[PDB]
Write an enzyme that holds these catalytic residues in place. Sequence first.
Site, PDB file in Angstrom:
ATOM      1  CB  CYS A   1      -0.954  -0.001   1.228  1.00 51.87           C
ATOM      2  SG  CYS A   1      -0.326   0.214   2.824  1.00 51.87           S
TER       3      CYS A   1
ATOM      4  CB  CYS B   1      -1.433   3.196   3.236  1.00 56.17           C
ATOM      5  SG  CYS B   1       0.126   2.287   3.159  1.00 56.17           S
TER       6      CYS B   1
END
Length: 252
Positions: free
Chosen positions: A75, A157
């Site tokens: 991520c 992320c």
Amino acid sequence: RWRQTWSGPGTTKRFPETVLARCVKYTEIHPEMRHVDCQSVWDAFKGAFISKHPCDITEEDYQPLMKLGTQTVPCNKILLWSRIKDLAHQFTQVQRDMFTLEDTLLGYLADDLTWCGEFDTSKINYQSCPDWRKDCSNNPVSVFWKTVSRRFAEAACDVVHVMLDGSRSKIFDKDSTFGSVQVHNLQPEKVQTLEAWVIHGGREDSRDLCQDPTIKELESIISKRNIQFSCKNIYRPDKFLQCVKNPEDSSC
Ligand SMILES: Nc1nc2c(c(=O)[nH]1)N1CN2[C@@H]2O[C@H](COP(=O)(O)OP(=O)(O)OC[C@H]3O[C@@H]1[C@H](O)[C@@H]3O)[C@@H](O)[C@H]2O
């Protein structure tokens, strides 16, 4: 025939065989997808658009395909881009520092292809497909990219990177997939920072394109989402790739 139904190029020749073969290849190489059934993938992909009016496609149409193509990507290592796909790919291929959609089964299957069907026959239309602008936005290819592009942004992320083409009149374009879909689907709970790398196209010594009004616009939008914004110029993309390949190079 001297006049096609739609304004866009038709389905890529041998589309079914190409998608199937890409699926076999991808699943051979990437162990995390080695168990995917490629016939099932093709069946789900076909099911999204065959026998459907090519101006009436929805995200729901692609859900069976999305489910089969479920895949985790690290991520914190996602690379987005706008109008500069080739450099993005060249960079990630050096040592897999980051991941684009083509590193995923679904992006790899669809990359550079066009496809559409016809209402109430099961034939693929190899002659023409709807143009997003002239014909309709809810066409098989446009709907596919919108859906998978949103999902990729949602997966990010930490620090997410975006390469932007600094030779364009709008370096950040709110109408692009990056600007209209991905910027608005980064999850502020998870994404700390969006970092743009503005890729120069011109002579040598040039402007600080991180001061471009469209870049200030991007900064403003991202910041108001509670995500930090950072920007860097890449003045010489040729030097950049050389430094990625060989970072001990004195000129780096
Ligand atoms: N083969 C791929 N195509 C696309 C990806 C992608 O990841 N792979 N896309 C989009 N996309 C489609 O390609 C054209 C040109 O984009 P182009 O005009 O050059 O840039 P966009 O910002 O629209 O779309 C690039 C952005 O969305 C995903 C990828 O993760 C990038 O961060 C346009 O119709 C896009 O919807």
